[PDB]
């Protein structure tokens, strides 16, 4: 199979999925490799090739530091890159239904990873199931991360910031220019992503350069208004100068620092990325999105509040235990190999880890808001309270505030609460429905009967896959055939949302009302 793109011909592979066929094009280049003088620059356009490019294996992953907290443990290593790390990494993948569709809706995946890590070749991002079951086209791209993707001295085009975001944007442009040759519909394109990928998706709703490159958006466990998602412009320049100091690149003429950084090999950049922040947290984002005056014209909180974004439908949601994953990355008394019963004193030490520069009074009122027990005798009270603190503050409350503000401008919005713990989840039970472990259900991995998911998990995945595809195709995430409960629109007044679980599906209102009132209204003033 060979498809003529506008820059040259590409060859894919046939895959057998569920007694049928899916065609895969893995590793299509969409930009000139950002090497040499092109490091830290925005992505440049690709030049034509007259031969046939073989797109038959995942391409290199972008340079990044690997998680090594649990060597040999599948729970953490399933997120580590599974191809070689290289600066030559700006490639994308395309999954096509077989036979060739005539005008299929396109789903574009943007992976997360704190803007520091990530790759589209991960097993749980495999788009072949979605192409097979719902006959949509799935696209995913690799984008630069860390300093090589988000180092910023604003206004300076040698390192303007938001390069990884522009990588994503150029991939969206590739779909616009090429997807029809694959049988796809460039007028029906839905972005979806998780964590930092969901925050990227929400920034594409704000960026005018991206407004004509997609139709709808899905935000799983993330948004730009989350406290970890946007780097202040003070912080950006500090961490840039700190990295120059650590490497030996402190110049005075600010353009001369970047040329010094361009002569360091990528490994010396990666080794020093960690220490650009003096006192970080488990949720620290060393180099992330900034207000650059290009991709981002103003502070995103101002654009959201004043209705300056793409007007379209959105699907937003969170998991029940978003915070627990971060507790085994620094909190005292927590571990993946015990049950992590902590004391009140260990709870107070956890808050200092996650809220280092906050007043003594601020941590006291976090403790006060989250220690009104039902059962005063339960030993896991403080353990579960600290996870809820981290999850509410960093993910759930920002996502709800995002949806409320977005829908106030007349757009249909739908919110979900994912509360099923995967039967193949390798982390212990006390960590619950963790950050990132709805992804395998969205991509339809439990549909593979040869994988030891339960029968109920196959059913829930089949339902989620249909809702997601119906949202992309028709702007309405209903499962209309098997007498499901209807997913109601999220409005600022009643704030209805749908729960996703094996046992039951229910409509509820005002998720975490009391806790998010504290985080969104009171806490910013301490
Ligand atoms: C902006 O950065 C400076 C310099 O950052 C240094 O901090 C070290 C801890 C280390 O990471 C090194 O690589 C880096 O260059 C910050 O100054 C430092 O701030 C910390 C925390 O307050 C102090 O402990 C250090 O003594 C201090 N060093 C100096 C030379 O001033 C500065 O605070 C930072 N601005 C922020 C975080 O707003
Ligand atoms: C849950 O585990 C933590 C972590 O303890 C680590 O070190 C060994 C004890 C190992 O067996 C394994 O449990 C784990 O890798 C326990 O906290 C530790 O407690 C000791 C006791 O003095 C302290 O010295 C350590 O600093 C501390 N580690 C951390 C990360 O806080 C904790 O006691 C345990 N809880 C249980 C068993 O209920
Ligand atoms: C493919 O379909 C195009 C129309 O797509 C529709 O446009 C708007 C209303 C969006 O809501 C989108 O989701 C819809 O699917 C046609 O204009 C085009 O000619 C068609 N092309 C081919 C080759 O069939
Ligand atoms: C998949 C990796 N995940 C744990 C194994 C980490 C903690 C996620 N993470 C993350 C991942 C890589 C590097 C830094 C971070 S800080 C962060 C902030 C906001 C969302 C996610 C992240
Ligand atoms: C691309 O794939 C075809 C089919 O396997 C192969 O014969 C061809 O030689 C490949 N091109 C290369 C390796 O340049
Ligand atoms: C800094 O160096 C650049 C590159 O040579 C030059 O264009 C610019 O004028 C210099 N500016 C200052 C203030 O030295
Ligand atoms: C609806 O139910 C049938 C069995 O009655 C099942 O095979 C099918 O996959 C279900 N559809 C969805 C979208 O879940
Ligand atoms: Cl469009
Ligand atoms: Cl940070
Ligand atoms: Cl709950
Ligand atoms: Cl006390
Ligand atoms: Cl609408
Ligand atoms: Cl309710
Ligand atoms: Cl609640
Ligand atoms: Zn992740």
UniProtKB/Swiss-Prot annotation:
Belongs to the type-B carboxylesterase/lipase family. Changing residue 198 to T: In BCHED; enzymatically inactive in the plasma. The keyword DNA damage does not apply. N-glycosylated. No other PTM detected. The major N-glycan structures are of the complex diantennary type with 1 and 2 N-acetylneuraminic acid molecules (Neu5Ac) making up approximately 33% and 47% of the total N-glycans, respectively. Only low amounts of fucosylated diantennary N-glycans are detected (approximately 2%). Triantennary N-glycans with or without fucose amount to approximately 13%, whereas 5% of the total N-glycans are of the oligomannosidic or hybrid type. Substrate binds at residues 113-114. The modification Phosphoserine is found at residue 195. Disulfide bonds join 62-89, 249-260, 397-516. This is Cholinesterase. Its EC number is 3.1.1.8.
């Amino acid at each position: 199979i060979i498809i003529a793109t506008k820059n040259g011909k590409v060859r894919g592979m046939q895959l057998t999925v569920f007694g049928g066929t899916v065609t895969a094009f893995l590793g299509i280049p969409y930009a000139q490799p950002p090497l040499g003088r092109l490091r830290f620059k925005k992505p440049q356009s690709l030049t034509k090739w007259s031969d046939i490019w073989n797109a038959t294996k995942y391409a290199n992953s972008c340079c990044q530091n690997i998680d090594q907290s649990f060597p040999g443990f599948h729970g953490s290593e399933m997120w580590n890159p599974n191809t070689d790390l290289s600066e030559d990494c700006l490639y994308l993948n395309v999954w096509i239904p077989a036979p060739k569709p005539k005008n299929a809706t396109v789903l574009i995946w943007i992976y997360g990873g704190g803007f520091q890590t990530g790759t589209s070749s991960l097993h749980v991002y495999d788009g072949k199931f979605l192409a097979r079951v719902e006959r949509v086209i799935v696209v995913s791209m690799n984008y630069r991360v860390g300093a090589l993707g988000f180092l910023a001295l604003p206004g300076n085009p040698e390192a303007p910031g938001n390069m990884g975001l522009f990588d994503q944007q150029l991939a969206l442009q590739w779909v616009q220019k090429n997807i029809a040759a694959f049988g796809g519909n460039p007028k029906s394109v839905t972005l979806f992503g998780e964590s930092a990928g969901a925050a990227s998706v929400s920034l594409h709703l704000l960026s005018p350069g991206s407004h004509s490159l997609f139709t709808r958006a899905i935000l799983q466990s993330g948004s730009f208004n989350a406290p970890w998602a946007v780097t202040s412009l003070y912080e950006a320049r500090n961490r840039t100068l700190n990295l120059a100091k650590l490497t030996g690149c402190s110049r005075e003429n600010e353009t001369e620092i970047i040329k010094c950084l361009r002569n360091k090999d990528p490994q010396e950049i990666l080794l020093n990325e960690a220490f650009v922040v003096p006192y970080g947290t488990p949720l620290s984002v060393n180099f992330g999105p900034t207000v650059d005056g290009d991709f981002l014209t103003d502070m995103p909180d101002i654009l959201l509040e004043l209705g300056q974004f793409k007007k379209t439908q959105i699907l937003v949601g969170v998991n029940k235990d978003e915070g627990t994953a971060f507790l085994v990355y620094g909190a005292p008394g927590f571990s993946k190999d015990n049950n992590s019963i902590i004391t009140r004193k260990e709870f107070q030490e956890g808050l200092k880890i996650f809220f280092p520069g906050v007043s003594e009074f601020g941590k006291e009122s976090i403790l006060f808001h989250y220690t009104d027990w039902v059962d005063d005798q339960r030993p896991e009270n403080y353990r579960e309270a600290l996870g809820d603190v981290v999850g509410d503050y960093n993910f759930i409350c920002p996502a709800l505030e995002f949806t409320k503000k977005f829908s106030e401008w007349g757009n249909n919005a739908f919110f979900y609460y994912f509360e099923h713990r995967s039967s193949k989840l390798p982390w212990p039970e006390w960590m619950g429905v963790m950050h990132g472990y709805e992804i395998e259900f969205v991509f339809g991995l439990p549909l593979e009967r040869r994988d030891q998911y339960t029968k109920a998990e196959e059913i829930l995945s089949r339902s989620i896959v249909k809702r997601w595809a119906n949202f992309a195709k028709y702007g309405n995430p209903q499962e209309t055939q098997n007498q499901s409960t209807s997913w109601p629109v999220f409005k600022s007044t009643e704030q209805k949302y749908l729960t996703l679980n094996t046992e039951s599906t229910r409509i509820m209102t005002k998720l975490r009302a009391q806790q998010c009132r504290f985080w969104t209204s009171f806490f910013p003033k301490v």
